[PDB]
Amino acid sequence: LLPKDPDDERNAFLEVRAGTGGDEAALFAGDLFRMYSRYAEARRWRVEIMSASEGEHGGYKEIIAKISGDGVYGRLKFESGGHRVQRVPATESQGRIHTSACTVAVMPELPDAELPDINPADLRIDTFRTDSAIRITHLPTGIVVECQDERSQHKNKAKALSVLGARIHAAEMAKRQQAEASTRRNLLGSGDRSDRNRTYNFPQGRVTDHRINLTLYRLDEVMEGKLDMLIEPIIQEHQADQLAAL
RNA sequence: UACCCGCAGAAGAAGCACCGGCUAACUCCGUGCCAGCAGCCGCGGUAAUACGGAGGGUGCAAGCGUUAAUCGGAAUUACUG
RNA sequence: GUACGGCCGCAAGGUUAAAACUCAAAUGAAUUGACGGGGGCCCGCACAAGCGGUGGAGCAUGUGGUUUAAUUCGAUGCAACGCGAAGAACCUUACCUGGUCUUGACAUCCACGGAAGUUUUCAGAGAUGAGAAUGUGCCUUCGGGAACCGUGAGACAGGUG
RNA sequence: ACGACCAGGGCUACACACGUGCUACAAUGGCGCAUACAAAGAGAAGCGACCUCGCGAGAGCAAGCGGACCUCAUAAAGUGCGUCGUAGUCCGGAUUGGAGUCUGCAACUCGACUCCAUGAAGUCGGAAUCGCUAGUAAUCGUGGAUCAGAAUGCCACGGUG
RNA sequence: GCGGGGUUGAGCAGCCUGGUAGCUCGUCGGGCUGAAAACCCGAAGAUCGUCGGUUCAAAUCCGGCCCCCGCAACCA
RNA sequence: UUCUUCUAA
Numbered sequence: 001l002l003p004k005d006p007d008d009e010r011n012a013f014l015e016v017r018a019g020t021g022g023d024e025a026a027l028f029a030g031d032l033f034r035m036y037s038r039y040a041e042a043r044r045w046r047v048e049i050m051s052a053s054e055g056e057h058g059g060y061k062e063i064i065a066k067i068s069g070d071g072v073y074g075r076l077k078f079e080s081g082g083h084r085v086q087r088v089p090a091t092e093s094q095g096r097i098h099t100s101a102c103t104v105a106v107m108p109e110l111p112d113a114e115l116p117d118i119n120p121a122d123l124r125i126d127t128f129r130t131d132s133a134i135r136i137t138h139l140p141t142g143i144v145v146e147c148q149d150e151r152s153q154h155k156n157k158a159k160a161l162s163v164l165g166a167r168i169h170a171a172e173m174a175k176r177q178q179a180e181a182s183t184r185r186n187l188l189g190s191g192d193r194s195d196r197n198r199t200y201n202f203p204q205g206r207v208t209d210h211r212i213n214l215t216l217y218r219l220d221e222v223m224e225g226k227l228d229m230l231i232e233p234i235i236q237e238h239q240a241d242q243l244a245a246l
Numbered sequence: 247u248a249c250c251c252g253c254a255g256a257a258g259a260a261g262c263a264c265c266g267g268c269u270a271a272c273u274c275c276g277u278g279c280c281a282g283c284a285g286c287c288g289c290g291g292u293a294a295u296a297c298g299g300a301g302g303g304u305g306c307a308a309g310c311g312u313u314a315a316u317c318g319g320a321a322u323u324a325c326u327g
Numbered sequence: 328g329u330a331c332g333g334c335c336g337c338a339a340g341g342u343u344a345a346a347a348c349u350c351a352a353a354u355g356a357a358u359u360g361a362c363g364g365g366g367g368c369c370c371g372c373a374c375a376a377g378c379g380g381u382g383g384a385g386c387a388u389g390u391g392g393u394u395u396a397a398u399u400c401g402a403u404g405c406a407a408c409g410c411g412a413a414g415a416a417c418c419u420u421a422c423c424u425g426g427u428c429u430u431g432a433c434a435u436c437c438a439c440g441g442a443a444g445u446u447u448u449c450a451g452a453g454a455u456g457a458g459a460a461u462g463u464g465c466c467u468u469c470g471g472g473a474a475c476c477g478u479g480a481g482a483c484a485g486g487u488g
Numbered sequence: 489a490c491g492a493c494c495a496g497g498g499c500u501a502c503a504c505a506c507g508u509g510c511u512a513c514a515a516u517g518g519c520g521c522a523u524a525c526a527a528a529g530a531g532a533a534g535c536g537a538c539c540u541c542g543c544g545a546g547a548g549c550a551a552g553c554g555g556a557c558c559u560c561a562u563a564a565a566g567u568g569c570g571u572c573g574u575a576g577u578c579c580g581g582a583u584u585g586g587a588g589u590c591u592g593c594a595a596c597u598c599g600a601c602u603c604c605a606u607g608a609a610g611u612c613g614g615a616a617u618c619g620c621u622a623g624u625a626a627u628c629g630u631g632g633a634u635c636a637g638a639a640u641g642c643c644a645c646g647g648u649g
Numbered sequence: 650g651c652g653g654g655g656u657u658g659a660g661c662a663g664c665c666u667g668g669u670a671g672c673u674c675g676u677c678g679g680g681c682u683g684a685a686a687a688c689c690c691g692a693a694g695a696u697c698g699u700c701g702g703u704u705c706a707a708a709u710c711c712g713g714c715c716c717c718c719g720c721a722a723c724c725a
Numbered sequence: 726u727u728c729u730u731c732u733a734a
């Protein structure tokens with residue numbers, strides 16, 4: 001009955017990087033990615049890693065994936081933000097609590113047909129080491145998306161453009177939503193993609209949201225993909241933001 | 247005018263600060279190195295006497311705090327010293 | 328001991344000498360320690376002297392990793408790794424997949440209704456579903472209870488969380 | 489329901505990586521026959537002779553012994569002879585087919601063992617690294633617990649040295 | 650416009666008159682260390698830029714192209 | 726002869 005965001009039914013391009021705190025966050029970049037792998041397989045969604053980058057110490061410097069299926073952006077759009085891990089390092093033999101965090105970007109599946117204002121004069125495309133590596137740079141936004149992991153040039157080009165065109169959608173629809181003042185009533189959270197949304201205390205096994213301040217000692221389950229325990233009450237409060245302003 | 251006389255009924259009249267230590271005075275609940283606190287040492291990194299609330303208590307009192315400000319403590323420019 | 332200025336110098340620079348700022352310390356000796364690619368001493372299959380073995384092979388066994396609906400969990404320098412576990416076909420099993428159950432398997436309390444209990448048929452993977460003969464061991468100025476089943480009420484249980 | 493019960497699963501998966509073992513790469517050996525020699529334990533439905541039958545795994549009889557009595561119980565390395573003749577071998581045994589045996593509701597996952605066939609790798613192992621100072625190392629058997637069944641493990645025990 | 654070259658990941662040898670893919674580090678894995686380095690040990694990886702031809706056979710020889718790299722774009 | 730380093734209750 002509620003007027004919904006029509007990009008919710010789109011799928012999700014996904015962008016995870018390493019964060020602050022050292023290898024712990026870079027591990028925690030790789031640690032979170034297994035959960036969404038468990039989640040999207042539980043959600044019967046196809047995980048498609050478009051590009052990946054470790055810190056070569058067991059932790060991912062970054063990773064770009066696409067998760068596709070049924071209403072994938074409508075379940076993952078809330079996740080974009082800071083997410084903190086609290087644990088004890090293995091090189092520490094005293095129990096000094098180091099803390100680290102990571103950065104999340106969730107974008108709708110935006111086709112280039114749904115991107116009419118794309119312009120190759122507004123693009124800068126680099127081909128390097130038949131050369132298979134593709135670096136596409138969107139000139140008015142400065143958005144640079146590389147793809148080199150495929151064996152051929154044509155496969156890397158569409159993969160570097162689709163994430164970039166999603167980042168054009170990620171830039172512009174954020175710049176449309178932050179411009180609209182009364183539309184943010186139907187919005188759970190701040191609307192910026194930088195809030196420390198959820199803290200992971202591992203010795204407590206604690207999952208603690210911060211936008212609704214929902215605390216769970218269910219981390220072992222959640223890390224293995226029991227995440228609709230969290231995503232659904234977010235939407236229940238997100239649509240409570242939608243219903244109470246109507 | 248001061249002042250004096252009766253008049254009504256407990257009637258018409260109490261608060262602010264603080265309680266980890268220094269420093270008199272504490273428990274409980276929320277809270278979780280967040281929110282905050284803070285003169286100093288310092289708290290909050292789930293069991294907070296230090297955060298917020300409750301009660302309870304301390305201390306002043308029609309004020310109570312805060313800040314600014316000057317000397318003091320400082321023999322910390324030392325004549326004393 | 329720096330900036331600026333003065334001073335001096337052939338120059339190098341010297342000399343005179345700040346403040347903004349920032350910290351809640353800085354330092355001094357001395358003490359117990361620890362540590363030393365310091366010194367001295369002593370001891371150790373520590374080295375030396377010896378013997379065999381591992382690492383190569385195959386397999387057992389364990390962990391990691393990976394995988395899994397699940398591969399239950401713990402132990403991971405020495406001092407985890409044929410460890411927990413002196414022995415996972417089921418059981419174990421703590422895990423998965425379904426099937427189920429809720430004063431609950433169980434403790435005790437509390438009534439209530441059948442003495443228990445005895446044999447059986449069928450459904451069902453089984454957890455269970457009605458059939459189905461009974462008994463009166465116990466006791467009583469005898470709810471038929473207690474033993475022992477079932478029902479109910481909550482007290483609570485339970486948890487290898 | 490992080491509680492209770494049932495079946496089935498899984499705890500045994502599998503590119504790998506490591507630990508720890510076991511068995512090898514042979515002639516001081518292999519194989520065959522003959523023969524010598526323990527110690528310590530275990531045992532009542534037990535240990536189960538004895539004989540029977542089965543190539544054997546076993547099956548049946550069923551003594552005997554709660555055990556300084558009987559059973560387990562024949563120690564093995566060895567000794568003696570024969571044989572193999574320096575080879576992937578009469579080394580070595582992986583794997584796999586077949587066919588059983590036993591256990592236990594039940595051996596698909598997922599058992600142990602027998603028989604037949606099969607006969608990988610392996611011809612002393614890089615950098616490295618381990619153990620051990622005498623009955624020790626080395627090497628050879630035996631037993632025990634755990635245990636329905638099921639140990640190259642663990643715990644003992646002797647032999648040689 | 651003309652010359653040059655395009656080679657395991659990388660940077661490069663060999664490119665030899667065509668029967669012929671080496672190096673080094675990197676990588677991977679062990680060893681060493683309490684750990685990381687360093688070092689040691691062991692591993693693997695190339696269709697020789699491209700489209701073709703000549704050839705018994707092309708990295709090789711040849712031709713065209715892609716890429717650059719050099720060079721030259723003069724005299725009033 | 727040679728011989729470096731150890732984030733953060």
Ligand SMILES: [Mg+2]
Nearest residue numbers: 382506507679
């Ligand atoms: Mg090792």
